[PDB]
Paper text:
Leucine-rich repeat kinase 2 ([name]) is a highly pursued drug target for Parkinson’s disease (PD), which is the second most common neurodegenerative disease projected to affect 17.5 million people by 20401. Autosomal dominant [name] mutations with higher kinase activity are leading genetic causes of both familial and sporadic late-onset PD cases. Here we report high-resolution cryo-EM structures of [name] in complex with a panel of small molecules, including two type I ([name]-IN-1 and GNE-7915) and three type II inhibitors (rebastinib, ponatinib, and GZD-824).
For type I inhibitors, we designed an LRRK2RCKW construct with M1732R mutation (LRRK2RCKWm) based on the following observations and rationales. Therefore, we introduced the M1732R mutation, which disrupts COR-B dimerization and [name] filamentation, to prevent protein aggregation. Second, the binding of type I inhibitors could lead to a kinase-closed active-like conformation with flexible N-terminal ARM-ANK-LRR domains, which did not show interaction with the rest of the protein upon activation. We determined LRRK2RCKWm structures with [name]-IN-1 and GNE-7915 at overall resolutions of 3.5 and 3.8 Å, respectively. Despite small differences in the overall structures, [name] KIN domains with type I inhibitors and ATP are almost identical with RMSD < 0.5 Å. [name]-IN-1 has an IC50 of 65.1 nM to [name] and 1.27 mM to Roco4. The cavity shaped by KIN and COR domains in the active-like [name]–[name]-IN-1 complex is sealed by KIN–COR interactions. This is accompanied with the opening of COR-A and COR-B subdomains, more intensive interactions between the KIN N lobe and COR-B, and a novel interface between the KIN C lobe and COR domain.
Author numbering: 1329 to 1356, 1365 to 1613, 1623 to 1652, 1658 to 1662, 1666 to 1798, 1806 to 2253, 2259 to 2397, 2409 to 2477, ...
Write the structure that this text describes.
C-alpha cells in the first residue's frame, strides 16, 4: 500500500577509526561502548522521494566486543567502513577481518569504505593499498560488494562530507534486494499499523527489562484488529525484525519465541554491563552486577534470558587475557609432539568464543560421561586453551602467527603418545564439527588448508605437508618415504594419527586375515546414504560390512565413528572392526531385516506387545544418544533394525546408520540434514537453529508409522511432493479413523503430544521413555467417553461370543429409568426412557431353546422390566417386589435360575424358563433378613466348577444357598475382633468374591476382610489406604471388587484408583490412577472372540462417565515388563563398564 521509507544503516570499523565522530558530522565522544542506535531523518531534495529515516548503528571497534557483534549484523543494510590514515597503509590491511565478516553474514550489502584524519595524514600511499585490495576483492569471493570509496576530513564540516552524504542517499535508493527496491517498497497497511503500536508501547515498557510476551501482543492486536489475522502475524513480525524496530528470536534452540523485544538499543547494552562489572573470577557479578538484582525483579525475567558460564560461576568470553600466558611444555623435541596447523584466511567473527566454549567438556578418555576424568589445569586466554591432564597428555589448541604470513593458524600441540593420539582424534573432530555447523564459509569449494607437521630428524627444519596429500599417501601405504632418499622413513601414525584411524581402541581393528569377504552383488543386504552393506564372516561369525564408495572423504567415516566406537547400548548397533585400506566398517547383523520390510510385507507378526517393545527400544536408544550430547536427525522406519520377532526378548529393535549424527551442545545445531517426509518442521525450514528436541518429532512419526503398520509410507510413495509438505506442516490425519487400525487410546495421546509445532512443548527423550515404560500403556485397548452429564450405575456385557459385542447401561441422571444401548465397535450411544424410577441393576438371561435372548431390569419402584435383546417391542413386566430390587445375578447349577435381590433382605428365586410369561410368580421366596438389612451382595463360586454354593450377603451378614435352596451358613460380620477397625466394619456389605476364601467390602470401608469358609473367622484384613499411602478424610473406599481366576485381585477404590493385589499371599502388584476420578462398576467380559477384558466404568469429574476397557492379562504384563526392563538395565551397565575399563 503506502510506501515504507525505512532502512537500517550499519557503521563498522576498528577502534580509534572515528566511526562515532563521522556519524556526528553527518547528523549535524570518549568511546562507543556496546552499540549506539540512532534515527536519521534525511530529506531527499532531488525528485519527490519520501524522507528517508535510517536506523544507524555504531558498531564498536574495541576488540573485546567482537564476539557478539555478528548476531546483530544482518541483511537489509548499507555498511560503512572507517579506517584511520595516521597509521599509514597497514590500517587498510588491518580492516580485512572486518570486511571478510561482513560478506559472510551480509552477502548483499553495498559496503562503502570511508577514510579519516586527512589533516595530518597522506593519501597517495593509502590509495595504492586501497586500490590493490579492491582489485583483489572482485576475484576473492569473500569480500563484500565494495561499490564506493572516500576520504573524509576532520569533524569540521568540509566539502568532502557533502559528497559522502550525497553518496549514502544515492546508494540507499540504488540498493536492491531480490530485484526490488528496499527503500520505498510497497507494504500492506496492516504492517505499518503494527509498527505504530510498538513505538507507542516502547515509551511505557519497563526499563529494567523491556519485553512483551506472546500474551501481551495477542491482547493488544485483538482489541485493535488493524486488518490483521492469526497467520499473517509471523510475516508482520519478521518484516519488523528486518527493519529494526522489533527484535524477535524464533530459533527453537534459543527458546525465545514467546518474548518480543521492543527495545533494540537495550539488547546491545546488556553485554557492556556484564564485561565492565583475568584468570580469577568472583561471586560479585552474580550478586551485585546492577541495582535491578532483587527477589522479584530477578526471578521471572532472569529465567527468560541466559546470555558461556556453565554452572559451577561466571566466565564470559570477552574478559579473557589479551595475550598468551607464560607456559612451558614438558618436552620440545621435534619427534615427540604432533602439530596440526589450520591455515585459514581470517579468523571468523566469534570463532574463538565458540571453540573455547565447545572444548570445555571433560570426557575425552571416557566418552558419554562414563567416568568423569580429573579436572585438568586449564589455562584461559583470548584465542586458545591448554587442557592438561598429565605431563604426557596435554592439548594446546591456540592461535599462532608466522613470519611473512598475513593468515591465521590453529596450532595443536598434542604429544606423540597413545594418549596424545586420542586427544588429537577428538579435538580435530570437534573443530570440524564447529566449522560444518556454524562457519560454512571457510569450508566452501577450499579456502581452509590443513597442514600436518613432520620431522625426519630432531633439530632439523620442521616441514609442512598438506593433509589431503598425506591422505592419498596413507591409502597407498602406511609409511612415509623421504623423496631425497628412502633410507629414512617415519610412520603416518606419528604425523597424522587420526588419518589412519590410529586413535581407535585396539579392541576394534580390521584384522584382514580372518575376514572372508565377497563383494560380488549376490551377498547384498541393502543400500544406504553413502555406502553398501554386504554379508561377510569375521572370526567365524556373521557380520554386515558397510563398505564406502569413491565419493567419500575420511570426515564422513569419522562422523560415524564418534557415535559408534564411544557409545555402547543394547539399542545401538556396535562395531567389531574398522579398516581404512579397503575403507569398510564391520557391523552387527540384524537377523530379520530392517523394520520397513516388516511393516509392509509382514503385516501378520505385529501384535500389540511387539509394537510396544519396538517403540520402547528406539526411545531407549534416543534417550542415551541425547544424554551424550549427540543428535540423530535420521530416524526413519528403515534405520530401526530388528534382531528377533519375539515379544519377550532381551534385544528386539536397534538403531543404525549414524551417517548424519553430529554433536548438539547447548548452542544447538544449524544444518538441516535429514530425510524428506520424516523431518521436524524446524528442520524443514533452513533459517532456524534447532535443538535435540527436533528429533522427538521424528520419533513420533516413527511411532505413527508403527501404529498404522506403515500406512502413511505406502500412501506417500505415490505423491512424494505431498509426503514432504504434509509431514513438515503437521496437519496429520487421525490414525485410527482413517487407516483402520485397532484403537490404542493413550499412544495416540503420546503421538499428538510429541508432534506439537512448538518445540518447547514436545516431551524430552527422557520423558517419552518414561511414558512408554508404563505397563498399563500396553493393556488398555479402548476408552469411550459417554455424553455429558449421565449417571450410569449398572451395566452388563452381551455375552453370546458370536452375535454382537455391546454394553447395556441403566442411566440414572434423571428420576426415570433410562436403559441405554452402547455398540462397542462403533461407539454409538442411544438411550430410552422405559421405567418410572431409576434402574438399579441389569442382567442378561440366555435361553438356548429357540435362541431367545432377554435382559431383565430392576427399578427402585419395585417393578422388573424384561425386554428382548434384539426385539424392541417385547416388553413385559413381572409382579413388583415389596421394595426396591438391587441385584439380578443369573447363573445355572442344570437349570438356569434368575436370582433376585430385593432391598428388604428377601431373595425370591425366579425361573429363567418362566420369563416368557407376561407376569409370573417367584418359584420359592426365601427369606434371609428383615427390611432394615439390604440384600445386595450376590455372587457365585468359580473354583473347581463348584456350581453348588452361591455365597451372598445381607446387611452385615453372610448367607449361602444351594440347589436344595437351604441356608447352609449365616455368618455374623458386625463384630470386630481387633475392636479398632470396627468403625469401617460397622457398615453394610457391598460385594463378595470367592476363589478359596471370602472377600468382604463395605460402604466407606477402606479395608477388605478375608474370611475362611471352613472356620468362619476373618483370616486377614487388607487395608487399602495402607497401599495408597506410598503414592499420596481420604478417598480410599472399596466401591467395586473383581477377582481374576487364579492370578490377581482387582480392587477398585472410590478415588479413581485400581489395586492389583497378588493373590498368592499378600503382595501389591501395582496401583493404577491418573485415568478416572471414581471407579464404580468393574466386571470381566468377552468381546468378538477376543476375551480377557475388564470393563472399568468411572466418572471423569459436569460429570463425564468414562467406560475404559482393560485386559485381564494386565497382572502378568506389569510383572513381565519390569523384569524385561531390569534385564536391559544390566546389559546397558555391562556394555558401558567393559568399554571404559
Ligand atoms: C540378514 O540381514 C538382513 C537381511 C535383509 C533382507 O531381508 N534381505 C532380503 C533379500 C535382499 N537381497 C537378496 C539378494 N540379492 C537379490 C539382493 C537383494 C536383501 C537382504 C535386510 C537387512 C538385513 N540386515 C541388515 N543388517 C545390518 C545392516 C543392514 N541390514 N543395513 C542394510 C542397514 C540398513 C539401514 C540402516 C543401517 C544398516 C546397517 O548399517 N547394517 C549394518
Ligand atoms: N576519525 C577521527 N577521529 C578523531 C578526529 N579528531 C579527533 N578524533 C578522536 O577520535 C575518537 C574517535 O572515537 P571512535 O573511534 O568513534 O570510538 P569507537 O567507536 O568506540 O571506536 C574521538 O574520541 C576523537 O577524540 C578526526 O578528525 N577523525
Amino acid at each position: 500500500a503506502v510506501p515504507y521509507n525505512r532502512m537500517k544503516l550499519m557503521i563498522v570499523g576498528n577502534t580509534g577509526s572515528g566511526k562515532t565522530t563521522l556519524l556526528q558530522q553527518l547528523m549535524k565522544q570518549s568511546a562507543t561502548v556496546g552499540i549506539d542506535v540512532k534515527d536519521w531523518p534525511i530529506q531527499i531534495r532531488d525528485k519527490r522521494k519520501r524522507d528517508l529515516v535510517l536506523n544507524v548503528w555504531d558498531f564498536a571497534g574495541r576488540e573485546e566486543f567482537y564476539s557478539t557483534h555478528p548476531h546483530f549484523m544482518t541483511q537489509r543494510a548499507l555498511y560503512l567502513a572507517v579506517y584511520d590514515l595516521s597509521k599509514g597503509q597497514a590500517e587498510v590491511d588491518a580492516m580485512k577481518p572486518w570486511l571478510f565478516n561482513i560478506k559472510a553474514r551480509a552477502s548483499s550489502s553495498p559496503v562503502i569504505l570511508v577514510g579519516t584524519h586527512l589533516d595530518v595524514s597522506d593519501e597517495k600511499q593509502r590509495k595504492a593499498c586501497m586500490s590493490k585490495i579492491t582489485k583483489e576483492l572482485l576475484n576473492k569471493r569473500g569480500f563484500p560488494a565494495i561499490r564506493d570509496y572516500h576520504f573524509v576530513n576532520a569533524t569540521e564540516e568540509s566539502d568532502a562530507l557533502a559528497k559522502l552524504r550525497k553518496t549514502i542517499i544515492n546508494e540507499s535508493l540504488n540498493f536492491k534486494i531480490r530485484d526490488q527496491l528496499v527503500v520505498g517498497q510497497l507494504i500492506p497497511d496492516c504492517y505499518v499499523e503494527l509498527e505504530k503500536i510498538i513505538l507507542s508501547e516502547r515509551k511505557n515498557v519497563p526499563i529494567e527489562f523491556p519485553v512483551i510476551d506472546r500474551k501481551r501482543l495477542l491482547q493488544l492486536v485483538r482489541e485493535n484488529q488493524l486488518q490483521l489475522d492469526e497467520n499473517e502475524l509471523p510475516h508482520a513480525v519478521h518484516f519488523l525484525n528486518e527493519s529494526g524496530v522489533l527484535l524477535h528470536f524464533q530459533d527453537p534452540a534459543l527458546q525465545l519465541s514467546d518474548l518480543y523485544f521492543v527495545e533494540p538499543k537495550w539488547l546491545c547494552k546488556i553485554m557492556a554491563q556484564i564485561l565492565t562489572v583475568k584468570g580469577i573470577i568472583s561471586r560479585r557479578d552474580v550478586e551485585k552486577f546492577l541495582s535491578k538484582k532483587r527477589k522479584f525483579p530477578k526471578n521471572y525475567m532472569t529465567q527468560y534470558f541466559k546470555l558461556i558460564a556453565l554452572p559451577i560461576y561466571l566466565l564470559v568470553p570477552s574478559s579473557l587475557s589479551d595475550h598468551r600466558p607464560v607456559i612451558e611444555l614438558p618436552h620440545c623435541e621435534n619427534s615427540e609432539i604432533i602439530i596440526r596447523l589450520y591455515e585459514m584466511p581470517y579468523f571468523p567473527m566469534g570463532f574463538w568464543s565458540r571453540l573455547i566454549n565447545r572444548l570445555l567438556e571433560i570426557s575425552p578418555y571416557m566418552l558419554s560421561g562414563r567416568e568423569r576424568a580429573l579436572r585438568p589445569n586449564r589455562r584461559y586466554w583470548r584465542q586458545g586453551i591448554y587442557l592438561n591432564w598429565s605431563p604426557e597428555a596435554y592439548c594446546l589448541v591456540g592461535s599462532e602467527v608466522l613470519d611473512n604470513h598475513p593468515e591465521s593458524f590453529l596450532k595443536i600441540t598434542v604429544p606423540s603418545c597413545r594418549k596424545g593420539c586420542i586427544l588429537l582424534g577428538q579435538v580435530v573432530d570437534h573443530i570440524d564439527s564447529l566449522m560444518e555447523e556454524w562457519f560454512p564459509g571457510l569450508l566452501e569449494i577450499t579456502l581452509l588448508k590443513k597442514w600436518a607437521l613432520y620431522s625426519f630428524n630432531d633439530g632439523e627444519e620442521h616441514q609442512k605437508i598438506l593433509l589431503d596429500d598425506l591422505m592419498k599417501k596413507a591409502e597407498e601405504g602406511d609409511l612415509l618415504v623421504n623423496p631425497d632418499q628412502p633410507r629414512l622413513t617415519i610412520p603416518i601414525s606419528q604425523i597424522a594419527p587420526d588419518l589412519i584411524l590410529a586413535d581407535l581402541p585396539r579392541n576394534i581393528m580390521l584384522n584382514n586375515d580372518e575376514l572372508e569377504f565377497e563383494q560380488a552383488p549376490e551377498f547384498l543386504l541393502g543400500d544406504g546414504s553413502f555406502g553398501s552393506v554386504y554379508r561377510a564372516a569375521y572370526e567365524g561369525e556373521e557380520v554386515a560390512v558397510k563398505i564406502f564408495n569413491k565419493h567419500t572423504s575420511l570426515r564422513l567415516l569419522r562422523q560415524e565413528l564418534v557415535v559408534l566406537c564411544h557409545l555402547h547400548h543394547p539399542s545401538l548397533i556396535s562395531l567389531l572392526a574398522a579398516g581404512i585400506r579397503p575403507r569398510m566398517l564391520v557391523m552387527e547383523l540384524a537377523s530379520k531385516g530392517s523394520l520397513d520390510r516388516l511393516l509392509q510385507q509382514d503385516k501378520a507378526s505385529l501384535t500389540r506387545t511387539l509394537q510396544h517393545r519396538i517403540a520402547l527400544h528406539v526411545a531407549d536408544g534416543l534417550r542415551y544418544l541425547h544424554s551424550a550430547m549427540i543428535i540423530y536427525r535420521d530416524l526413519k522406519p528403515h534405520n530401526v533394525l530388528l534382531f528377533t520377532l519375539y515379544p519377550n526378548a532381551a534385544i528386539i529393535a536397534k538403531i543404525a546408520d549414524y551417517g548424519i549424527a553430529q554433536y548438539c551442545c547447548r548452542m544447538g545445531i544449524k544444518t538441516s540434514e535429514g530425510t524428506p517426509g520424516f523431518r521436524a518442521p524446524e528442520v524443514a525450514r533452513g533459517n532456524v537453529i534447532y535443538n535435540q528436541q527436533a528429533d522427538v518429532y521424528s520419533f513420533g512419526l516413527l511411532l505413527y508409522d508403527i501404529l498404522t503398520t506403515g500406512g502413511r509410507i505406502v500412501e506417500g510413495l505415490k505423491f512424494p511432493n505431498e509426503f514432504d509438505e504434509l509431514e513438515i506442516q503437521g496437519k496429520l490425519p487421525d490414525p485410527v479413523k482413517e487407516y483402520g487400525c485397532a484403537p490404542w487410546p493413550m499412544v495416540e495421546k503420546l503421538i499428538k503430544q510429541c508432534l506439537k509445532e512448538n518445540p518447547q512443548e514436545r516431551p524430552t527423550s527422557a520423558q517419552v521413555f518414561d511414558i512408554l515404560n508404563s505397563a498399563e500403556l500396553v493393556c488398555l485397548t479402548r476408552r469411550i467417553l459417554l455424553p455429558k452429564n449421565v449417571i450410569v450405575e449398572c451395566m452388563v456385557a452381551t455375552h453370546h461370543n458370536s452375535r454382537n459385542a455391546s454394553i447395556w447401561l441403566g442411566c440414572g441422571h434423571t428420576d426415570r429409568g433410562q436403559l441405554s444401548f452402547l455398540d462397542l465397535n462403533t461407539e454409538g450411544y442411544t438411550s430410552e426412557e422405559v421405567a418410572d424410577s431409576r434402574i438399579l441393576c441389569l442382567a442378561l438371561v440366555h435361553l438356548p431353546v429357540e435362541k431367545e435372548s432377554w435382559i431383565v431390569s430392576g427399578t427402585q419402584s419395585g417393578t422388573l422390566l424384561v425386554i428382548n435383546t434384539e426385539d424392541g417391542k417385547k416388553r413385559h413386566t413381572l409382579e413388583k417386589m415389596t421394595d426396591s430390587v438391587t441385584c439380578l445375578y443369573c447363573n445355572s447349577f442344570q437349570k438356569n435360575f434368575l436370582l433376585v435381590g430385593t432391598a428388604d433382605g428377601k431373595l425370591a428365586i425366579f425361573e429363567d424358563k418362566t420369563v416368557k410369561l407376561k407376569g409370573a410368580a417367584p418359584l420359592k421366596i426365601l427369606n434371609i433378613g428383615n427390611v432394615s438389612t439390604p440384600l445386595m451382595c450376590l455372587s457365585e463360586s468359580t473354583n473347581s466348577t463348584e456350581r453348588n454354593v452361591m455365597w451372598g450377603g445381607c446387611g452385615t451378614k453372610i448367607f449361602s444357598f444351594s440347589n436344595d435352596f437351604t441356608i447352609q451358613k449365616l455368618i455374623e460380620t458386625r463384630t470386630s475382633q481387633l475392636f479398632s477397625y470396627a468403625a469401617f466394619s460397622d457398615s453394610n456389605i457391598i460385594t463378595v468374591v470367592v476363589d478359596t476364601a471370602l472377600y468382604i467390602a463395605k460402604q466407606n470401608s477402606p479395608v477388605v476382610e478375608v474370611w475362611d469358609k471352613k472356620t468362619e473367622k476373618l483370616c486377614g484384613l487388607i487395608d487399602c489406604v495402607h497401599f495408597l499411602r506410598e503414592v499420596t478424610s481420604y478417598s480410599g473406599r472399596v466401591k467395586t471388587l473383581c477377582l481374576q481366576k487364579n492370578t490377581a485381585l482387582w480392587i477398585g477404590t472410590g478415588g479413581g484408583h485400581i489395586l492389583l493385589l497378588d493373590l498368592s499371599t499378600r503382595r501389591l502388584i501395582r496401583v493404577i490412577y491418573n485415568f478416572c476420578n471414581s471407579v464404580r462398576v468393574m466386571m470381566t467380559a468377552q468381546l468378538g472372540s477376543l476375551k480377557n477384558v475388564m470393563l472399568v466404568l468411572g466418572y471423569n469429574r459436569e460429570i463425564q462417565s468414562c467406560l475404559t476397557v482393560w485386559d485381564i492379562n494386565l497382572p502378568h504384563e506389569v510383572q513381565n515388563l519390569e523384569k524385561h526392563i531390569e534385564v536391559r538395565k544390566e546389559l546397558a551397565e555391562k556394555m558401558r563398564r567393559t568399554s571404559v575399563e
